[PDB]
Amino acid sequence: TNTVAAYNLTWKSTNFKTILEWEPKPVNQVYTVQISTKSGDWKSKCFYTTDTECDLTDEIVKDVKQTYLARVFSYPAGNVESTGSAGEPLYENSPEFTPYLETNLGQPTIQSFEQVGTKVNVTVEDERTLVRRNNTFLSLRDVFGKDLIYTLYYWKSSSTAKTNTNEFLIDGENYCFSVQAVIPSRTVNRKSTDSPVECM
Amino acid sequence: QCASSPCQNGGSCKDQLQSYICFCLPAFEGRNCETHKDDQLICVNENGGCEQYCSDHTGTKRSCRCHEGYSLLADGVSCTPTVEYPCGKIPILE
Amino acid sequence: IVGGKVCPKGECPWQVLLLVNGAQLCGGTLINTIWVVSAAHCFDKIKNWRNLIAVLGEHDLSEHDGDEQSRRVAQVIIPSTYVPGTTNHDIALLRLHQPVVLTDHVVPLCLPERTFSERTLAFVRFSLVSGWGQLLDRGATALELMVLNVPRLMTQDCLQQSRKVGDSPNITEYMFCAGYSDGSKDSCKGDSGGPHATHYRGTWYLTGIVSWGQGCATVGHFGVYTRVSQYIEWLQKLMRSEPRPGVLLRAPFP
């Protein structure tokens, strides 16, 4: 056989940074990656590279809701081009990926939190995603829409809050707030990782 | 966890658990933005950004040809017909 | 053509109608003013080559408008690596006795370069096929030209999706499957030799030739087309050769 076939293709997308990763490390061979939409058009990327990862972020952000499918070729060291009774290059498909649902939610960062007495208001910053609109990065609020609901946990060294907006209102002592990102409209990867804990 | 100078070519980093995502300008792409999206004019990359034909030279930039009966314009990427009835074009659609 | 729509007159001008002794034989694709391209399996059961006529500009087989043209073909060329009754190496090159007059309804289709077809055109999903084949599976030949939009698939992906067929001929490097597996759209037999045209930036190119669709509109099967990317060097070498007296010449491949 001319080359080996790609296998164990996995998608790693956190905060919309979609990277296609696959083994094995090349042995006297090179790889090439193509990405396309369902019944769309195959676009090639990562030309004749010896890496085990390909950045397909710039292609999946065009249609956040469309499902994308990718494939990885394995060209040889002697017949990387030309014909010599050419056939079709050996390759392997990747699992179907939908950027709107299958991507992982990034680690949130608390923006500010103040004490006025009997009520404390926790605010969460609008995290920037990787969906490049014009020359600016679209925020999390304006990409997922109204489906991102935040959860807050509060304790005072001796111990849950829910809201549909990007701000928390609850009722002193030092209170440690942790925020978490979760969209209920997801079947997989519904929740995210807990934010760093910062007290008053 | 991003002090190891991960972002390359003007990228901006964001902290992640054991991970590092680089927010780069549109001119660069990649996990570390190590790819020069402008410096990849190879004929296998979308026909080298040319309309009909291209010919990748060894060292210098790619040169673009056209099919029989077609002459390329001054832009170097588009081809215009020369004969009265060109190929592959429906005359009733113009 | 099953599941397609009627192609408007003049939108499919590179299609030709091959008639033998005043009978429907196969479709064809016009590439230049002298030479026409069609399938090779159409000429297995023929022995009188004098009455072979190609019709250009025809759209409606019932009406005779002024755009129709007919020229006699004086030579048919098939690769030496083709044995009659087999799907492999299903391509034929025909030389008209006299050239055709290019009009608004008759324009040729470019034969792409091998490098251009193998790298750029092969990764366009929806390429269009046309022909006068049976509108329904084992039905009646259509009176008007029918065009169909089909997706292009590689042999590796095509093989796994195929249903349990009693006989699966090998899909060599000179062929590729294209179509739908739900039985809605497929390449029929009567339209064999039709153009599998591919679009790229305002220009149309020939990328395949319909050879066998495993019948017509078969559930869980695709329409295998002949790859033209493997014959461009072979076609042009003899396309520019001298007119040898042989009507059916078995040119050596490649």
Added chain:
Amino acid sequence: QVQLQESGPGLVKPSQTLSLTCTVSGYSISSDSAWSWIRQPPGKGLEWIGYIQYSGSTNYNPSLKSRVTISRDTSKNQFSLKLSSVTAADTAVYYCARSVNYYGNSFAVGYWGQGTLVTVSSASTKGPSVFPLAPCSRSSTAALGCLVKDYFPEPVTVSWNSGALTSGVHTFPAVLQSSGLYSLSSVVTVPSSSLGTKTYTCNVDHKPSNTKVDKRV
């Protein structure tokens, strides 16, 4: 056996129309061919004026597309050109030619015509007077020739003994005299023994003037 030849006046005044006619014998204009007119100035700068293929469709060079018209008549098996507003830069030898390996988009040029020289000037046509050149001393090998002095334009051809002898003939290229008038001389080399019996004559023809003088040396 297919051959073609162009017929023209040989002289066109500036600010007028240039016309040339090419006749084809061994091939039919309306079967399979593209027919083109190609000109070459004295600098030998081959220029493709335009072409007309069968069925009457024409395509011209964009450099001069605004002043060129090419037509044909299938009955007479000939096709002509009409170039208007000719200047001094149009002085060239125009070749009629047929396209080989013509498959639509482009072709080659396999069959060529003999070429006819056209001179563009505001002068008049003058017929030449031939002067003999004979050796002054009667003796292995001797030389004799003919002198052509006052002729314009320059499609002048000289033949010796109606083509009987062709070895040693040297028709020198025309040199413009100090007055601006062309003059050429043709010389042949013959053995001195055949100077009393064989008659050597030079056949000088000037087609635009239609003057033919046969003088022997």
Added chain:
Amino acid sequence: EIVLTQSPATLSLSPGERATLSCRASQGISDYLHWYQQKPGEAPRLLIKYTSQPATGIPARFSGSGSGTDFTLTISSLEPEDFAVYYCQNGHSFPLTFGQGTKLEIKRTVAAPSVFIFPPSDEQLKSGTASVVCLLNNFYPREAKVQWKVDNALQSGNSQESVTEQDSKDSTYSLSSTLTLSKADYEKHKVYACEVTHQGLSSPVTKSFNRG
């Protein structure tokens, strides 16, 4: 418009050598390039079509290669009959463009010229003009100089030199020198002679003629 450049402009090679001709194109015209040979006084001939296929009747010595921007024309075993100007034609896109032309002058063995002098004809004197012609017929090379001294006097304003192209048989040039003077001035001197100097001649031999 495809601008086609031909190099070198002039090439001088012996028959025993091989000649290489280049044809650069402004764009990639693939193999659609045809080669021509134009002997002087004749129409061009299609030597090689599509840069590789030779025509019918063309000698096997001619060959071609290249595709895209640069094309080469090769004459393997050059022969004395190869003296001509060669052209390559664009054959891919209109406007159809031909080359500038590369003259190919051939070399040969050193020759000893022949010089002859002709008095003006008596019938020519009737028109009031006189012209005496001194000619070279089989002289090689072309780098020759002729000095005309009339009655021990040299003229430098009325001398006209015409040279033919290289002939196809023995590759020898021919030169004709004519100086036109008034018939009255032709009766002012007595002996008109032409002095010819050449590398093949050991000494410059002068041929003269006396009146009567």
